[PDB]
Design a protein around this ligand. Structure first.
Ligand SMILES: [K+]
Ligand SMILES: [K+]
Ligand SMILES: [K+]
Ligand SMILES: [K+]
Ligand SMILES: [K+]
Ligand SMILES: [K+]
Ligand SMILES: [K+]
Ligand SMILES: [K+]
Ligand SMILES: [K+]
Ligand SMILES: [K+]
Ligand SMILES: [K+]
Ligand SMILES: [K+]
Ligand SMILES: [K+]
Ligand SMILES: [K+]
Ligand SMILES: [K+]
Ligand SMILES: [K+]
Ligand SMILES: [K+]
Ligand SMILES: [K+]
Ligand SMILES: [K+]
Ligand SMILES: [K+]
Ligand SMILES: [K+]
Ligand SMILES: [K+]
Ligand SMILES: [K+]
Ligand SMILES: [K+]
Ligand SMILES: [K+]
Ligand SMILES: [K+]
Ligand SMILES: [K+]
Ligand SMILES: [K+]
Ligand SMILES: [K+]
Ligand SMILES: [K+]
Ligand SMILES: [K+]
Ligand SMILES: [K+]
Ligand SMILES: [K+]
Ligand SMILES: [K+]
Ligand SMILES: [K+]
Ligand SMILES: [K+]
Ligand SMILES: [K+]
Ligand SMILES: [K+]
Ligand SMILES: [K+]
Ligand SMILES: [K+]
Ligand SMILES: [K+]
Ligand SMILES: [K+]
Ligand SMILES: [K+]
Ligand SMILES: [K+]
Ligand SMILES: [K+]
Ligand SMILES: [K+]
Ligand SMILES: [K+]
Ligand SMILES: [K+]
Ligand SMILES: [K+]
Ligand SMILES: [K+]
Ligand SMILES: [Mg+2]
Ligand SMILES: [Mg+2]
Ligand SMILES: [Mg+2]
Ligand SMILES: [Mg+2]
Ligand SMILES: [Mg+2]
Ligand SMILES: [Mg+2]
Ligand SMILES: [Mg+2]
Ligand SMILES: [Mg+2]
Ligand SMILES: [Mg+2]
Ligand SMILES: [Mg+2]
Ligand SMILES: [Mg+2]
Ligand SMILES: [Mg+2]
Ligand SMILES: [Mg+2]
Ligand SMILES: [Mg+2]
Ligand SMILES: [Mg+2]
Ligand SMILES: [Mg+2]
Ligand SMILES: [Mg+2]
Ligand SMILES: [Mg+2]
Lengths: 91, 70, 50, 99, 49, 250
RNA sequence: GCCCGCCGCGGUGCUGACGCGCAGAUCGCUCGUCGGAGCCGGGCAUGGGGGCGAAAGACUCAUCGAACCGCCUGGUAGCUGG
RNA sequence: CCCCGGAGGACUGAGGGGGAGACGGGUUCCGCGGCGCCUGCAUCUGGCCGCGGGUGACUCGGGCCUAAGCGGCGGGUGAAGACCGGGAAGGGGCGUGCCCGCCCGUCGAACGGGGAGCCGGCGGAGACUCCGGCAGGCGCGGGCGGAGACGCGCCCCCCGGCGACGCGCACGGGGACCGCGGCGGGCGGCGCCCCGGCCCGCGAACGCCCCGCAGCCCCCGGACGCCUUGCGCGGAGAGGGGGGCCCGGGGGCGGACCGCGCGUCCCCGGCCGCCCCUGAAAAGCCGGGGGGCCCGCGCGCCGUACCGACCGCACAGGACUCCGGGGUCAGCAGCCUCUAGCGCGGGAGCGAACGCGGCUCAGGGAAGUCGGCAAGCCGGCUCCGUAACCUCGGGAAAAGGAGUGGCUCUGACGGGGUCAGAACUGGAACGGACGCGGGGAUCCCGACUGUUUACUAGAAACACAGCGU
């Protein structure tokens, strides 16, 4: 049976720190606890080990990524643009 | 005296700057005998004491008697 | 302390060695009336800093 | 009875190299016996896993035969790593000469 | 849970039950379906029948 | 008429020196040499590691010894997407891939770069913090200068033989999580410097600070101080063009 | 950096004891806290108009709105005593 | 005699008034003798006084290594004292003559790293140090097997390893401890009962053989399974069958009485969780690639006695760390206790006021007082039953009720206690000592945990996350 209605994993904080901070942390902490898909392993086993460091627990690659998620939107866009600029440098 | 009569060991005061090899050599050359092992300590007054065990085929009674130690 | 350097051991040893009274034959020989050696010390009320 | 014991080391500060166990002696007495730390065994230079075949003893106390394995890169690579290196070298030779 | 797992394991090995019945009951045990060993043995008879 | 204030005491060092114990070392680009200056050199990413006091991670990368036998170990600020066992390249002829080091003259307009040198060969000093980058804006060949955008948004001319690394720094988003507690701030600053917690000037006596004293806590004069004020006087807002919180900038 | 509670660490009230003291700050009962911005030991660093301070003008060896030691110095006093 | 002995009566109560170390003290240690001083009373006592004595190391520590640091460096600067510092033609192997080379400290830890020790005995005072026995370390002298995972002399350059590391609720294994019975040996009491009470029944380091869960690897082959308290794992090859390696451990033989249990402490194991925190270094020792080539003897220097005998002018203060039995119990709480140890400036008489620490009081119940200050009420466990408001997490033990002993039985869980139920019975009693919230309706201030005027102020003051310049 469901145990809380809204607070989710922020129920560890009790009544402290106010509503806006707890609302921000629910999102942040869910993101940083999630399992991600290993871009090499093929499997969903990547977990965070430090702020920007992600390890695949199956194939054991280590990767550099975001603070609280494996990929970031700026990096997605930058990688796409750099790939396009390379391809334009191939005649 | 118990130490000499059994355990075949004799007790001296020596110069504080003397090590175990020097002590063994000096006892051998002076008393014309055979040392086996040497223990040492410095007393609370600053003297050096040597426990000298002679060879298992020598009588400390006899060497100490020739000394005058009895 | 049970873990002391030889230099501190030797200076302590000299204090112990010299903490003594005037011999009686010395008193007779030198014709003394003062018979207490006032450079003696006792461990309970001393502050040897050696 | 009373089985309490006193410290065996020079000081009583209980660091990780000053750990003892307790044992009963033939004279009916409770004695303290030091518990040495156990060194790790060598690990793979490529993947960091324990090399198979070497006991967890400092090599100064092992005979020469006991400190080694019988393969090229015997104590340095785990064998999967050796296979991978051989394949890399040969196939790269093949793709660098003759296209 | 150790008592229930020991009994279910023995049967599957002896081939008293198949591997699929074994897995269905293993899950039901971890879900608190059985309060003791006797109730579990009766549920096995029924499934087998 | 007072004592020395807190900002005056930090310059001597003592308890205000950086906590550098168990740091991995200084992070740098590979030194420019003959082989990179004429061609390209190859390295392999060996590890990705966390550095004490630093938000972004570092990469330990191994190259061959180009003047002897053996190998050579380098520490890099890690671009996001770099991974253990990757092959990186460094030279005038390296390709356009995340993690490679190229002269900024050979890098096309529109590109994200990190760890950029402001003068050639100094080994990299711009856009080094987590999530930062520089854009390559334009090339002027005759003067042999490149125009870049710094993370503040300022524009700058640098030489075209200054080198950079392709990509953006990993660890981005770090500041979007609130510190919840005094304890989280305590741990964060314990990894860096003795700079925390902070006591306000108006909470002090006049001997300790120029904002101190009074029967109500209050500064007393304007807290905009001029640019040429002397040490001990230069507290508050230093040489402010304007103040207050109003919208509508750009 | 959750709650009751032992050692520990602290120090609320009795404006209790004591106040020619057990003591130049202690004792009894009661009380705050007890997984943490937690408590303890050793080594090391910062020196006087300087240091150090989650800020009380607090602390810097019973000394602090400027330590202690010797000297300048038998410092000067239209002021008190002889 | 407050000393010694015997008998009795008590206490400290395993976080000890016990047994031992680090620091500080420095001979306070031991034996014999003694009472001039001290031992705020006495003394035939003694840490006091006199006279003799006393601490033994290849294996314990220091010496070595490096930490945070500190010093040194052609020189640089300043009136000097001195302070500051890489840009300097900076040293080794050997064997002539060649060859290799960028530039510090045999300063800094008696808790970090660091080759190697166990048992029995002997003395007034020493022991991991002596003696006897049994070992270990470092030195010096007279190319093969397998299918495979794997099994069975050096020197230089480079690549590596060990040394070498955080926290946590659980779960698992070993050791020690602790209990319950059997059997052997010995006690004590005994008015009645008593095969029912008490004490003793011991096995080290080290060497050879076997045995070791988890975990990692090999072979076959190719998949709706395997599996934990929790998880976790598999075509990047599971399950099944057969193997390899590690495992601070256990057993057998040496060295040399018998079973069965819950629990506690310590270490270890595999996982899982956490971090804007990611949890030393070096000496020393070893491996890989490439290339060139049994028997004897010894192990130096320093510490080692004792003590909370230390600091507070001598003292209810202050003063780091080991080991940790039984009963009641949730328990390292309180209360009683085995082992061990037993001072605390002295006694006797009387039973006034007053005080200091305690106890009980009819009827009333805050009328007392600036003020319920002080005191008292409540309190364990199980069941029942719980409002406003709210940041939806709380409020909450809200408020309020009921039961609880002894004895004789019954049921449930795979030898072990727990949980549930019934009959009988006792002044109308039962958390019978001990331990242990009083509650509620509101207003002001500060969001919260935290900090502070050592010695008259703990707060509304400081800090804080957040916000802004
Ligand atoms: K001593
Ligand atoms: K003294
Ligand atoms: K002034
Ligand atoms: K000033
Ligand atoms: K000043
Ligand atoms: K100033
Ligand atoms: K100051
Ligand atoms: K601070
Ligand atoms: K502040
Ligand atoms: K002011
Ligand atoms: K307490
Ligand atoms: K107070
Ligand atoms: K009173
Ligand atoms: K007190
Ligand atoms: K608590
Ligand atoms: K300073
Ligand atoms: K100072
Ligand atoms: K001053
Ligand atoms: K002064
Ligand atoms: K003076
Ligand atoms: K002078
Ligand atoms: K003066
Ligand atoms: K005057
Ligand atoms: K005057
Ligand atoms: K006068
Ligand atoms: K006597
Ligand atoms: K000059
Ligand atoms: K100078
Ligand atoms: K040294
Ligand atoms: K050191
Ligand atoms: K240390
Ligand atoms: K040491
Ligand atoms: K270490
Ligand atoms: K190799
Ligand atoms: K000794
Ligand atoms: K009377
Ligand atoms: K009276
Ligand atoms: K009243
Ligand atoms: K009245
Ligand atoms: K009250
Ligand atoms: K109640
Ligand atoms: K009952
Ligand atoms: K406040
Ligand atoms: K708290
Ligand atoms: K507070
Ligand atoms: K006050
Ligand atoms: K106060
Ligand atoms: K308070
Ligand atoms: K207040
Ligand atoms: K304050
Ligand atoms: Mg010695
Ligand atoms: Mg103030
Ligand atoms: Mg001012
Ligand atoms: Mg708490
Ligand atoms: Mg509490
Ligand atoms: Mg005069
Ligand atoms: Mg004067
Ligand atoms: Mg008692
Ligand atoms: Mg004595
Ligand atoms: Mg007297
Ligand atoms: Mg040793
Ligand atoms: Mg050590
Ligand atoms: Mg002794
Ligand atoms: Mg360490
Ligand atoms: Mg001793
Ligand atoms: Mg009234
Ligand atoms: Mg507050
Ligand atoms: Mg005060």
């Amino acid at each position: 049976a469901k145990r809380t209605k809204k607070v989710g994993l922020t129920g560890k904080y009790g009544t402290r720190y106010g509503r806006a901070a707890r609302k921000q942390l629910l999102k942040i902490e869910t993101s940083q606890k999630a399992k991600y898909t290993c871009p090499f392993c093929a499997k969903d086993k990547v977990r965070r080990t430090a702020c920007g460091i992600w390890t695949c627990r199956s194939c054991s690659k280590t990767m550099a990524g975001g603070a609280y998620s494996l990929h970031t939107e700026p990096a997605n866009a930058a990688r796409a643009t750099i790939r396009r600029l390379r391809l334009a440098r191939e005649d | 005296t118990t130490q000499i009569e059994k355990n075949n060991t004799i007790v001296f005061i020596v110069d504080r700057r003397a090590s175990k090899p020097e002590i063994r050599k000096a006892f051998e050359t002076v008393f014309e005998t055979k040392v086996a092992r040497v223990n040492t300590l410095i007393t609370p007054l600053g003297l050096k004491k040597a426990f000298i065990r002679l060879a298992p085929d020598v009588q400390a009674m006899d060497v100490a008697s020739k000394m005058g130690l009895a | 302390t049970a873990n002391k350097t030889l230099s501190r051991k030797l200076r302590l040893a000299k204090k112990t060695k010299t903490n003594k009274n005037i011999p009686r034959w010395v008193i007779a020989k030198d014709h003394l009336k003062k018979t207490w050696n006032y450079k003696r010390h006792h461990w309970r009320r001393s502050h040897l800093k050696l | 009875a009373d089985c309490r014991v006193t410290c065996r080391f020079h000081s009583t500060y209980r660091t990780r190299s000053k750990i003892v166990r307790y044992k009963r002696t033939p004279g009916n007495r409770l004695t303290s016996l030091r518990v040495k730390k156990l060194p790790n065994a060598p690990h793979c230079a490529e993947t960091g896993k324990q090399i198979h075949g070497i006991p967890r003893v400092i090599p100064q106390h092992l005979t020469r035969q006991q400190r080694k394995v019988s393969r090229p890169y015997g104590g340095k690579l785990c064998g999967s790593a050796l296979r991978a290196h051989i394949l890399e070298s040969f196939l790269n030779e093949e793709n660098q000469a003759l296209r | 849970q150790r008592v229930l797992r020991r009994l279910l394991s023995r049967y599957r090995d002896d081939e008293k039950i198949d591997r699929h019945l074994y897995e269905t009951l293993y899950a039901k045990a971890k879900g608190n379906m059985f309060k003791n060993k006797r109730v579990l043995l009766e549920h096995i008879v029924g499934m087998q029948k | 008429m007072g004592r020395r204030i807190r900002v005056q005491r930090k310059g001597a060092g003592s308890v205000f020196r950086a906590h550098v114990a168990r740091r991995l070392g200084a992070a740098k680009l590979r030194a420019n040499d003959f082989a990179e200056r004429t061609g390209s050199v190859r390295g392999v990413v060996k590890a990705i590691l966390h550095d004490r006091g630093r938000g972004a991670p570092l990469a330990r990368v191994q190259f061959p010894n180009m003047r002897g036998e053996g190998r050579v170990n380098e520490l890099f600020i890690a671009p996001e997407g770099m991974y253990t066992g990757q092959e990186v390249f460094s030279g005038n002829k390296a390709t356009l891939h995340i993690g490679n080091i190229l002269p900024v003259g050979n890098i096309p307009e529109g590109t994200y770069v990190c760890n950029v040198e402001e003068k050639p060969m100094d080994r990299g000093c711009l856009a080094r913090a987590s999530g930062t980058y520089c854009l390559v804006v334009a090339h002027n060949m005759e003067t042999n200068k490149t125009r870049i955008r710094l993370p503040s948004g300022q524009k700058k001319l640098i030489s075209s033989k200054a080198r950079a690394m392709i990509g953006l720094v990993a660890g981005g988003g770090r500041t979007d999580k609130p510190l919840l507690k005094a304890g989280n701030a305590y741990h964060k600053y314990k990894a860096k410097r003795n700079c925390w917690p902070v006591v306000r000037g108006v909470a002090m006596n006049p001997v300790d600070h120029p904002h101190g004293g009074g029967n109500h806590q209050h500064i007393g004069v304007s807290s905009c101080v001029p640019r040429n004020a002397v040490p001990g006087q230069k507290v508050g807002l230093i040489a402010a063009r304007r103040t207050g919180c109003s919208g509508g900038k750009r």
